[PDB]
C-alpha cells in the first residue's frame, strides 16, 4: 500500500533523511489516500491508468529516456475527452496536495542553531536571521544602539502589493479545504497520538481530500474582475489578519530582548497591504470605472466585516468593571441614549448595562462597524444607501479613538497587562488595515493619457497634443496646472477609451482617499507623461490626488528616466505638489522582454543607483516600487537575501514590492510561512538601510557592461530579428490559446513568461546569459575567476544567478523537444533544436560560474520539492501537447480506448485549461 | 545546591542551549560532588575557602573587575603552606574534571547534517568530512573513480609520533580513574535511568572523583623509562582497540562507494612511533641504556597485549571445520604437544585436535608468552636463556598462523566469521607489529662533529671541526667507501663522545623493527647528514636508520635546499636512501629564532622548495612535522591544517608529532580517538588529490614584506633589548621550571623551545606565539590601506593563512593581560615595569589587528564551542595563576611577609605549591605555540 508508494517516491529524491524530513512520507500518504478516492469515485480501471501515467513519468524523470515520454504519450492520446478530463483533474489535484505537504515541511523544518555569518545564510529559511538576530547584528556588528534600531523600525514602512493570479484565482471554499487537509496531515504526525484519534484523523484526511477534488465545476464564464478580487482577498481571513499582530508581538519580544522596555507602538505604520485587483486596467478594458468602484466598496465591506466579526469576542473578554473617569462619562452618555430593544446579533442582544463599561463603549463600535459594512453592501447591490455618515466610520481615527480610550482606561486602573492582550492586537489590526484592508493602485498606460489630452486640445481648437514636442507638452501642461478655468466642457467629444479613462478620474474624485494608493503610468517615457496625469487629477478637483508613479519599461526608457526625473524635480509646481516624496516603479519582466533578463537586471541596478542620487541632490525621498519578475518576488528565504542585495540607499526605510499572484499561496497560505514572510520583509528592510551590500568593483561593472551589450544582442537577434521566431513561438507554445481566453513587443510580459513556462523551456529567463558568459570567458580566461568571485562575493550577482538556476531546475528541454515534434512544422525543427543547444550551453556556463556540478546543489531542500512535483507536471505537459495537437488539427485522430471511468458536453478546450492551470500551479514563479 | 553552581557557571558562558549542550551541567555536577568530598576530607572551612576562590575567580572572569583579582590575592596569600597545597591540588583536580567533561561533550555533540562545502567546514569537528564524505567528494567533485580512491588509500601511510608530556606524564592508574569518572558522568545522562541506578551511579561518581583526588603523592623526578611507560598508556585505554574500529569504518565507507572488498588487513595505513627514550637532544639523562630499556619495554608491552587477548579469541574460535592446510598443521602441533598443566587462565589442559583453530592459536599464545618473558628477563636480569625459535623475532612469524586461520575459515564457508575478531587481530598485528611504537633517535649535529673530531685528531690527520664544509664532505665520502674501520680500541673519549658512540652500539645490537629515524637536531649542512651515515656504517648496523635533518633557524631553513641538492647529487647517498628521504621541520624551534609569523611563512616556502628538488632528483620526500604547528592542534582544526599544506608535501605519507600536552584530548576518550585517526587518514588522502589553492603573487609579495618586518620586531625585543632576558626571568617562572625539571638552557637562543613557550603560557601572556604579527599587520596596512582587504581576502580564501591566524586567535582567547600585569607588579623591579607595559600595549594592538583581519568583533566568534570550553576552565586557571604569582614572590623575596590565617584544613612547602600550580596551569592551557 503505503510503503510501496514511499519506495517509488524515495527513488526520485535521494538525500540524508533525519527526523524532521517527512516530505516524501507526506506525499506518499496523500497520494495513497487520493488513489483510494479515485478508485472509489471513478473505478479501479481509472485508478490504475493514473498510477500508470505516474509511473511512466517518474521513470522518465529518472533516466530521461525519450521512449518513456512516447509511451506516456501513447497512453494519454488514446483517452477520450471524459477520461482526459479526469486524468488532468487528478494530476492537478496531486500537485496541490504536494504543494500543501511542502508547505508543512518548510514550516516545521529545523532552524540551524549556529549560523556562519556569511550573507548567503539569508537566502535559506533554515539559516536566515529572524527579527531579533537582525537587531543583534545591527547592535553588535554595526554599533547601532538599541534606541537607534528601535527608532528606525518605528519610522519604517513595508508595503506589499498583491497582484492577480495570472491563471487561477483559488476560491475561498477550496482554500479552506486545502488548509484542513494540511492540518489533518500535521496532526497525524503529532507525538503520542492514540490509535482511535489516528483512525479518525485518517478518515478526516480522506474526506477533505475528496471534498477538495470534487470542488471542480468548470464554469462557462471567465471570472469577473470583482470575483477575482474577492478570491484574491481570501488570504487575509486565512492568515494575514491574524498574522500581523502575531508578528508585531514578536517584535515586542525582540525589542525586549535587546533592552528596549516598551512595545512597538500600536499605530506605527510598519506593514501596509495594497492591491492592483480592479485597479490595473493597462491593456485591460474589462477593468472599468464601475469595476474600480466595486472593488473599493468590497474592500471596505470586508474590512468592516472582519472587525465586526471579532468585536463580540473582545466584548466578552472585556467584562471588567473598573474604568477611569473619561470612559465612565462616555459609557453613561451611550447608556442614556440607548435603545430599549432587541439587536439581532449573536451575542449581546439586550441592552448593555452600565456596570459593564467597556462593553458599552465596544457595543457602540459594533453598531458602527455593522452600519459601515451595510452601507457598502447597499452601495454595491442597490447603487446607493440612506445610511448617513454619522452612523458609520468614514475615517480610521473614529474607530481607533474608542479603542484607545479602552486602552488608557485599563492602563489607568492598573490593568496595563490586560490591555496588551486582544485589545492591543485589535488596535494593531486597525492601524494596519484601516478602513480598507488594501489600498488600490490605479494603473493605465501613458498613451491613453495622451489620447485624452489630444481630444481636449483639439476640441479647444488649439492644436493636437499628440503632435507636440516634449518641450511644448511640458509648457502647456504647466500653464494649465495653474489654469483659471476648467479644461473639459460638456460637449467634449469622447471615444469609448477616452470616456473610460476620464470616468476613472471621476471615481477617484468620488470615493474616499483611503481607498487608493498610487497612480501608476505604464509605458512611461517622459516628464510630460507624469504631468499629464497630474493635470487630469487637478481637472477633476480630486481633494487628495494620488501620487503619480512612472513605470519605465524598456531599456531606452530606463536610460531616459534620469533626465525625466531631474526635469520633474526642477519644476516648482511639481516639487510643491509631491512634498519631498516620489515613487518610481521598475518592472523586471517588462525590461527583460525588451532586452533579455541579464541586461535588464544590470540596467535596473544602475538606473536605481542613478535615481537615488538624483533624488538626494533634490532633497526628495525616493521609493522604488518593485514590479514583478525580480529576485525580490521569489518568496521564501531567497527574498531575504534579494532584499539585502539592493543597491545602497534604494530602500531607505520604505519598501514597496509586488507579491505576485503565483507566489501568494507559498508566502501566506500556511500560518508559519505567513509569519516568516512578514518577518523577512521587515528584517531585511531594516537591515539594509544600516548595512548596504558591497558596491561592485570597477572591473566588475566594466565586465557587466560588456556582458550586457552581448546578452542584449543575442536576445534581440533571436526574439526580434529572426523573421520566423514569432511563427516558431506560436507553434511551440500554447501562447495563442492562452490569449483567446505587432509581435513580441506588443505581447505583454505575463503571457510571454507564462507561455514558455508551460513548455518547461523558460526561454525568457535565460536567453542572453549564454552569450554573455561565453564571450566574457573567451575574451579573457581570467574572467571565469572574476565571475566566480562575483558569484561568491557580490550579493546582486549571487541572487541574479540563483534565480536563473532555480528556473533551470524547473526546466526540461525534453518537453520542448516533444512539442517541436508534435506541433512545429518540419522546416522549423532545426531552429527549435538550436534553441535547445543554447539552453544546454547556457546552463552549463551558469553551473561553472556557480561552482556546481548539478543544479541547485546549493539548496537541496528546494531541489527536493521541485523534483517531487516533476512527474505530475510532466504528465500534464504531455496531456497538453496532444490536446493542442487535436485542437489545432481537426484531422488528427488516434484510436481511442473504450471509456475507462465510471461515475455513481466538456471538450478539448476544458482539458487544455486544466493542464494549463495545473502546470502553472506546479511551476509557481519563474521570470 | 547544584542549581546555584549551574547559575554561576551559566553566567560565564551565554550561548544558545539545545539538548546536546550539557557541558555547563556536567561541570556543575562535578564541582558540586568535589566540593562534598573536600568538605569530607578536609572540613567545611576548607571547602568554603575553595568555594570562595572559585566564586571570586568566576566573578573576575565575568566582568574583569581588578578588585576581584585583589580579593582573590588577599585570600590566597594569607594561606599557610598546608592550606596552599590543598587549594592548588583542588584547583588542579577541577581542571582535570572539566577536561573530562569537555571530552564527553565533544564526543556527543551533534554533527551538522548539511555541510556548506567550504574548506572552513574542515576546521570544526561538527562539520568536518568523515572518511566516507571524503571518498564521495573525491569521486563526485574531483572525478576520481572509486578504484582510484581505494588504490591511493591502500598505498597511503599515516605515522603519528608521540612525544613526552612537557610537564606531567599521567600514570596509568590515574588515567583509568579519569576514564571511570567520564563514564559515570555519561551514564548519569543515559536515556531512561531508574532512580536507584541514578543514586548508585551518583555514589560511584563521588567515589571515583575522591580516588583520583587522593592519588597525589608528591621526591625524585620520573625516570625516562617510567615516563615512556606512562606515555604508552593510551594504547591500552583506546588506541589498541581504536585502530580496528576505524579500519572497519573504512570497510564500511568503501562498501558505500561501491568497492566490494575490505581494506587489506596488512596495508600499513597507520603507524605509531615515539621519541620517549630516543630523544637525547640537550638531554644527557637519555643514555644508551635508557634507549635499550624502552625498546625492550615496547616489545614486552606489545607481546603482552597480544597475549592478553589471545585467550578470548581462542574461546570464540571453537569451530571444528578447517581446511587441509590447517588440519595438517594442527595435527603436527598436537603430536608434539605437552601432556601437562600450562599455568594460563583459560586453556590449561592439552587442547584436543577437534578444536583445530585453538591448537594453532595455542601455539601462538606460547610464543607470545615467551616473547614477552624474554624481553622481561633482558630488562631485569641483563640477559635470557630463551632461544630465538621459542619467540617471535619478526612480525611475519606472528601473522602467518593468523592468516592460516583466516584462509581456513574462508575455505570452509565461514568468511563472515573470519572478518570478526580474527580480522581485528590481524589488523592490530599489522599496525603495531612486534613493537607498537618504533623509536626515533635524536641528537644534535654538534655532537657528531665532536665525535668525528676526536677521531680525526687521534688519527693524526687534523681536526674535523676546523675543516670547511667541502673538506668535510670529501673526507666523509672517502671513509664511507673506506676499507678499514675508523675507530681503534685506544681512541680517547670524553663522556659525551662515549655516550654518542655507545648509542650507535645499541642501534647495531637491537632489532631494526624497534627503530625509526635518526633525527639530527640543529642540522645545517650536507656533512651533518653524512656524519651520521658514517657512524652507522662504522658500527656495521645491518639496517641503518634513515637520517633526517631538522633545520631549525631561519638561516638553516634557507640553506636547506642547497644541502638537500648536494646530498641528492652524491651517488653514495642516492644509493643509500633508495628513492626516499625524510626531512623534519620544527615550528616552535623556528619561531623562537624569527618570530612565529615569519617561521610559518618560511616553512611554507621551504617545503615548496624541497618538494621541487625531490621531484627533480626522483626522490620521494616525507616532511616530518615537529611540534608547534597548526597540524599539532588536535581536534577539527587539525583537519583543515593538514588540508592547508602546500601542494605535494604529503603525497601519500604523513608524519606528524602528537605533542604530549595534546595526547589526552586526541586519544583519551574513545570517540575522540576514533575521530583523530579518521581526520589524519581522510585529510592525508584528500590532499594528494585536492591541494589547496596556491597563493596569488600579490599575496606572496606581501607575505615576504610582512616577514621582514615581523622578524625585525621579534628580534629587536627578544635578542637586541639588553634587558629582555632579565625581564623574562622576573616576569615568568622560567628559572623555577629549570631548577625543578629535560634540562632547559647564552640567552634565549640557547634556551630550548619548550621552556620558552611554556614560561609565557604560564603568565597567560603568550608572547612567543603573537610577537611580530602586530608590526607585520600595521606596517602592511599603513603602507597601503588596500592591504587590509587583501589580508581579509587571504583569511577568507587561503587555507594556510586562515589556519595560521586561527591558531593565534585561540592563543589570545587563552590570554589575560591582567595576569601578566599582576606578575609585573609583584615580581618585576620598578625600572623594568615600563618594558612590561609596552609589551602589553603590543599585545593589545596585535590582537586588534588580528581581529580586524579575521572579521571578528570578539575572540573566537568563529568558534563558539571552543570559546565555551576555554571560558569554563578560566576560573580554575586564574586561581592557580594568582596562587603561583604570590608563591613566586615568597620564594624569591625574603623581605615579603603577610599575616597568615590559622590553618584551615583538617583531615582524618612553597616549592611543592609552585609545582602543583605550574602543572595545573599547563593542564588547563594545553597546546598553544
PDB file of C-alpha atoms in Angstrom, chain A residues 761-844:
ATOM      1  CA  UNK A 761      11.658  25.686 -21.598  1.00  0.00           C
ATOM      2  CA  UNK A 762      11.728  29.154 -19.951  1.00  0.00           C
ATOM      3  CA  UNK A 763      13.479  30.981 -22.783  1.00  0.00           C
ATOM      4  CA  UNK A 764      12.567  34.451 -21.405  1.00  0.00           C
ATOM      5  CA  UNK A 765      14.584  33.866 -18.250  1.00  0.00           C
ATOM      6  CA  UNK A 766      17.909  32.553 -19.540  1.00  0.00           C
ATOM      7  CA  UNK A 767      18.276  33.709 -23.116  1.00  0.00           C
ATOM      8  CA  UNK A 768      21.257  36.017 -23.411  1.00  0.00           C
ATOM      9  CA  UNK A 769      23.149  34.721 -20.337  1.00  0.00           C
ATOM     10  CA  UNK A 770      24.912  32.175 -22.532  1.00  0.00           C
ATOM     11  CA  UNK A 771      26.462  34.611 -24.970  1.00  0.00           C
ATOM     12  CA  UNK A 772      27.347  36.900 -22.135  1.00  0.00           C
ATOM     13  CA  UNK A 773      29.227  34.141 -20.311  1.00  0.00           C
ATOM     14  CA  UNK A 774      30.891  32.648 -23.302  1.00  0.00           C
ATOM     15  CA  UNK A 775      32.019  35.929 -24.688  1.00  0.00           C
ATOM     16  CA  UNK A 776      33.401  37.036 -21.328  1.00  0.00           C
ATOM     17  CA  UNK A 777      35.310  33.724 -20.761  1.00  0.00           C
ATOM     18  CA  UNK A 778      36.677  33.554 -24.343  1.00  0.00           C
ATOM     19  CA  UNK A 779      37.792  37.181 -24.367  1.00  0.00           C
ATOM     20  CA  UNK A 780      39.906  36.548 -21.315  1.00  0.00           C
ATOM     21  CA  UNK A 781      40.247  33.238 -19.417  1.00  0.00           C
ATOM     22  CA  UNK A 782      40.669  35.228 -16.167  1.00  0.00           C
ATOM     23  CA  UNK A 783      37.033  36.297 -16.479  1.00  0.00           C
ATOM     24  CA  UNK A 784      35.867  32.867 -15.332  1.00  0.00           C
ATOM     25  CA  UNK A 785      37.522  33.514 -11.972  1.00  0.00           C
ATOM     26  CA  UNK A 786      36.283  37.086 -11.852  1.00  0.00           C
ATOM     27  CA  UNK A 787      32.704  35.808 -12.407  1.00  0.00           C
ATOM     28  CA  UNK A 788      33.108  33.153  -9.749  1.00  0.00           C
ATOM     29  CA  UNK A 789      34.346  35.804  -7.323  1.00  0.00           C
ATOM     30  CA  UNK A 790      31.293  37.890  -8.189  1.00  0.00           C
ATOM     31  CA  UNK A 791      29.036  34.905  -7.508  1.00  0.00           C
ATOM     32  CA  UNK A 792      30.671  34.255  -4.149  1.00  0.00           C
ATOM     33  CA  UNK A 793      31.049  37.839  -3.039  1.00  0.00           C
ATOM     34  CA  UNK A 794      28.568  40.183  -4.714  1.00  0.00           C
ATOM     35  CA  UNK A 795      25.057  39.707  -3.446  1.00  0.00           C
ATOM     36  CA  UNK A 796      23.347  41.117  -6.567  1.00  0.00           C
ATOM     37  CA  UNK A 797      25.213  38.741  -8.764  1.00  0.00           C
ATOM     38  CA  UNK A 798      24.642  35.830  -6.464  1.00  0.00           C
ATOM     39  CA  UNK A 799      20.878  36.323  -6.291  1.00  0.00           C
ATOM     40  CA  UNK A 800      20.560  37.011 -10.033  1.00  0.00           C
ATOM     41  CA  UNK A 801      22.286  33.695 -10.844  1.00  0.00           C
ATOM     42  CA  UNK A 802      20.343  31.757  -8.219  1.00  0.00           C
ATOM     43  CA  UNK A 803      17.010  32.743  -9.703  1.00  0.00           C
ATOM     44  CA  UNK A 804      18.101  31.512 -13.164  1.00  0.00           C
ATOM     45  CA  UNK A 805      19.430  28.334 -11.642  1.00  0.00           C
ATOM     46  CA  UNK A 806      16.068  27.648  -9.913  1.00  0.00           C
ATOM     47  CA  UNK A 807      14.370  28.136 -13.311  1.00  0.00           C
ATOM     48  CA  UNK A 808      16.767  25.631 -14.932  1.00  0.00           C
ATOM     49  CA  UNK A 809      15.838  23.167 -12.191  1.00  0.00           C
ATOM     50  CA  UNK A 810      12.183  23.573 -13.285  1.00  0.00           C
ATOM     51  CA  UNK A 811      13.181  23.184 -16.923  1.00  0.00           C
ATOM     52  CA  UNK A 812      13.180  20.122 -19.065  1.00  0.00           C
ATOM     53  CA  UNK A 813      14.236  20.555 -22.663  1.00  0.00           C
ATOM     54  CA  UNK A 814      12.782  17.051 -23.483  1.00  0.00           C
ATOM     55  CA  UNK A 815       9.308  18.563 -23.156  1.00  0.00           C
ATOM     56  CA  UNK A 816      10.134  21.262 -25.606  1.00  0.00           C
ATOM     57  CA  UNK A 817      11.524  18.575 -27.987  1.00  0.00           C
ATOM     58  CA  UNK A 818       8.279  16.618 -27.785  1.00  0.00           C
ATOM     59  CA  UNK A 819       6.324  19.787 -28.523  1.00  0.00           C
ATOM     60  CA  UNK A 820       8.567  20.501 -31.544  1.00  0.00           C
ATOM     61  CA  UNK A 821       7.891  17.022 -32.875  1.00  0.00           C
ATOM     62  CA  UNK A 822       4.080  17.239 -32.342  1.00  0.00           C
ATOM     63  CA  UNK A 823       3.358  20.857 -33.023  1.00  0.00           C
ATOM     64  CA  UNK A 824       6.081  22.525 -35.066  1.00  0.00           C
ATOM     65  CA  UNK A 825       6.408  22.101 -38.822  1.00  0.00           C
ATOM     66  CA  UNK A 826       9.436  20.171 -40.036  1.00  0.00           C
ATOM     67  CA  UNK A 827      11.220  23.219 -41.513  1.00  0.00           C
ATOM     68  CA  UNK A 828      11.334  24.955 -38.146  1.00  0.00           C
ATOM     69  CA  UNK A 829      12.520  21.934 -36.169  1.00  0.00           C
ATOM     70  CA  UNK A 830      16.236  22.960 -36.576  1.00  0.00           C
ATOM     71  CA  UNK A 831      15.538  26.306 -35.172  1.00  0.00           C
ATOM     72  CA  UNK A 832      13.945  24.636 -32.133  1.00  0.00           C
ATOM     73  CA  UNK A 833      16.932  22.330 -31.887  1.00  0.00           C
ATOM     74  CA  UNK A 834      19.405  25.246 -31.889  1.00  0.00           C
ATOM     75  CA  UNK A 835      17.490  26.891 -29.041  1.00  0.00           C
ATOM     76  CA  UNK A 836      17.803  23.703 -27.065  1.00  0.00           C
ATOM     77  CA  UNK A 837      21.507  23.680 -27.771  1.00  0.00           C
ATOM     78  CA  UNK A 838      21.691  27.291 -26.345  1.00  0.00           C
ATOM     79  CA  UNK A 839      19.749  26.227 -23.247  1.00  0.00           C
ATOM     80  CA  UNK A 840      22.207  23.456 -22.522  1.00  0.00           C
ATOM     81  CA  UNK A 841      25.265  25.579 -23.131  1.00  0.00           C
ATOM     82  CA  UNK A 842      23.859  28.459 -21.074  1.00  0.00           C
ATOM     83  CA  UNK A 843      23.015  26.101 -18.170  1.00  0.00           C
ATOM     84  CA  UNK A 844      26.495  24.686 -18.243  1.00  0.00           C
TER      85      UNK A 844
END
